[PDB]
Each structure stands twice: as structure tokens, then as C-alpha cells.
Amino acid sequence: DKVMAEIDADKLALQESRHGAQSRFDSFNTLYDEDVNAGEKQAMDLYL
Amino acid sequence: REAAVLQKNYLETQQAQTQAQLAFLQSKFSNAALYNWLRGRLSAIYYQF
């Protein structure tokens, strides 16, 4: 029984790793989906 | 850690049961002492016979 409970707590640890990997992927995806910022595009236009 | 503590309790139970078996082998009537006395007495009677 305690062996099975150890398996359960290890699964909980794995879920808590997966949540942070998910948040990092979502943050990098929403960083990638906007190539330039509004201020970055403004600075490009001002240089031009 | 709690699983390992339960394992140590299991090993203590095994030691207690082996001690109980050793106490039974000491305290049984047909132990080694009875057979030692039987073979000595019977060797004496066998030689005189």
C-alpha cells in the first residue's frame, strides 16, 4: 500500500513539472506570435 | 522513508518469529536432548545384550 502511495506522489511531482513546462511554452509562444512590439515598430519607423 | 520503516518492522517480525521457532525447538519434548539420552541408554543396553 505504501509503495502504491509513493507511485501516486511521484505522479504528482511529474504533474507539477509539466505545469511549469506548459507555462514556459505558452509564454514563449505568445512572445513569438508578436514579432515586433508597438514601440519596436515605432522605433523602426522613426529610424526610417 | 515510511515504507522503509515498515520494512524494518517486517524484519523485526521475522526475527521474533525465528526466535519463537528456536524456543519451540528448545521447549519441545522430542528435542535433541531426548534423542541424545535415548542413543546413550540404548547403546549401553545394546552392548550388554
A31, amino acid identity: L
Helical residues (DSSP H) of chain A, grouped into ranges:
2-32, 38-47
Experimental technique, in short, is cryo-EM
How large is the C-alpha radius of gyration of chain B?
20
Resolution to 1 decimal, in Å? 3.7
Q: Check: CB of residue A24 under 8 Å from CB of residue B24.
A: no
Q: What is the C-alpha to C-alpha distance for residues A26 and A43, in angstroms, rounded to an integer?
A: 27
Q: What is the C-alpha to C-alpha distance for residues A48 and A34, in angstroms, rounded to an integer?
A: 21
Size of interface A-B (CB pairs under 8 A): 5
Residue carrying the nine cell digits 543396553: B45
CB atoms within 10 A of CB A2: 13
* B2 in A contact zone (CB under 8 Å): yes
Q: What is the C-alpha to C-alpha distance for residues A3 and B1, in angstroms, rounded to an integer?
A: 11
Q: Check: CB of residue B6 under 8 Å from CB of residue A2.
A: yes
Q: Check: CB of residue A2 under 8 Å from CB of residue B2.
A: yes
Return the residue of A nearest to B2 by Cα.
A2
Q: What is the C-alpha to C-alpha distance for residues B45 and B47, in angstroms, rounded to an integer?
A: 6
Q: What is the C-alpha to C-alpha distance for residues A12 and B28, in angstroms, rounded to an integer?
A: 54
